[PDB]
Amino acid sequence: AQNPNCNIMIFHPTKEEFNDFDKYIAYMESQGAHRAGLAKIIPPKEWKARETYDNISEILIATPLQQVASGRAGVFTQYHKKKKAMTVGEYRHLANSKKYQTPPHQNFEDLERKYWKNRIYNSPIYGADISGSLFDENTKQWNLGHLGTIQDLLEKECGVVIEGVNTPYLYFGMWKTTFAWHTEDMDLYSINYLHLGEPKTWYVVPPEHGQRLERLARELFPGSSRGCGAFLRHKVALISPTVLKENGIPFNRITQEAGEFMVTFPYGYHAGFNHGFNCAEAINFATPRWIDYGKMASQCSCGEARVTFSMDAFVRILQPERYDLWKRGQD
Numbered sequence: 141a142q143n144p145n146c147n148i149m150i151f152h153p154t155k156e157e158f159n160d161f162d163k164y165i166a167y168m169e170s171q172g173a174h175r176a177g178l179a180k181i182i183p184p185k186e187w188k189a190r191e192t193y194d195n196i197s198e199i200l201i202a203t204p205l206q207q208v209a210s211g212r213a214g215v216f217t218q219y220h221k222k223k224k225a226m227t228v229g230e231y232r233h234l235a236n237s238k239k240y241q242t243p244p245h246q247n248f249e250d251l252e253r254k255y256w257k258n259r260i261y262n263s264p265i266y267g268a269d270i271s272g273s274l275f276d277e278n279t280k281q282w283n284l285g286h287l288g289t290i291q292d293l294l295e296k297e298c299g300v301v302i303e304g305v306n307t308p309y310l311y312f313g314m315w316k317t318t319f320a321w322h323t324e325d326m327d328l329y330s331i332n333y334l335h336l337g338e339p340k341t342w343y344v345v346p347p348e349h350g351q352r353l354e355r356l357a358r359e360l361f362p363g364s365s366r367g368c369g370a371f372l373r374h375k376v377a378l379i380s381p382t383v384l385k386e387n388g389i390p391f392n393r394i395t396q397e398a399g400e401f402m403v404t405f406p407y408g409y410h411a412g413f414n415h416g417f418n419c420a421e422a423i424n425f426a427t428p429r430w431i432d433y434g435k436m437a438s439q440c441s442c443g444e445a446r447v448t449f450s451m452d453a454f455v456r457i458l459q460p461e462r463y464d465l466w467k468r469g470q471d
């Protein structure tokens with residue numbers, strides 16, 4: 141078995157290897173990369189996502205989210221308070237302000253220490269989930285707005301024909317902006333490209349051990365657990381590496397820098413934070429190996445997680461028994 145310790149693997153494809161996305165994903169899995177839950181892909185040196193970022197300030201963040209924390213430093217939840225719209229120019233200036241900027245630090249490790257020590261005492265503002273793309277249309281390799289769609293994967297593998305579309309999303313971060321512990325909708329893959337700015341640190345639990353993280357989360361957030369049988373789908377809970385180590389949960393960590401892709405694999409729980417002002421682009425995708433994960437994915441039926449138009453069809457086809465009760469939560 142390849143990669144039996146479930147380490148995060150790092151790939152350096154050549155420009156020739158960067159032509160066929162699906163094939164490269166299947167290559168990485170042949171080497172065991174999926175067992176970690178997360179892989180890093182460093183693009184060929186000749187590749188570029190776009191020529192410059194020189195006019196991005198005009199993008200609008202229609203609903204910036206202030207991430208307010210509750211709990212203790214190592215075990216907390218966050219709630220997203222909606223703020224008034226602002227441009228990316230305005231957001232970048234806010235990120236660089238004395239109140240919000242990255243503190244002095246020695247290296248990534250000292251910064252990670254400061255994040256876990258101090259996150260809960262601040263409320264950074266996150267521009268999340270903004271439909272759009274920053275890839276140039278002329279970028280033909282690994283362009284996240286030109287991927288094969290999940291609906292087309294389900295049609296090719298299973299013959300079924302469903303509504304829905306699959307488009308990317310932009311994320312604008314600042315110091316301390318946080319993504320809570322989650323897997324993707326329907327336990328899909330994700331791919332995330334860091335277009336610019338400061339790094340993003342990731343934590344991940346190997347898919348084969350996801351249920352260990354779930355059981356810890358039920359113990360740490362016991363009222364949330366009683367409220368919903370899949371409350372990590374709400375994307376609000378944080379657990380620190382120290383707490384994971386104290387409780388024996390297998391995990392890994394890695395820092396993504398500008399210019400790098402990350403792939404998350406089906407049922408790979410992940411969480412993380414941004415080091416400073418940055419912009420990422422991400423999208424879900426499927427392969428044939430996903431289908432079984434989609435059939436088995438948990439769902440939030442409490443109604444909090446409230447998910448997309450396109451996820452309806454996935455549930456309807458892969459989880460027809462749940463269909464009914466899940467759409468009661470989504471209507």
Ligand SMILES: O=C(O)CNC(=O)C(=O)O
Nearest residue numbers: 311319330331332420422
């Ligand atoms: O970058 C972020 O804030 C969150 N992204 C992801 O969870 C991802 O790409 O799957």
Ligand SMILES: [Mg+2]
Nearest residue numbers: 195196198199
């Ligand atoms: Mg602009």
Ligand code: NI
Nearest residue numbers: 323324330404
């Ligand atoms: Ni994710």
Ligand SMILES: [Zn+2]
Nearest residue numbers: 368440442444
């Ligand atoms: Zn729920």
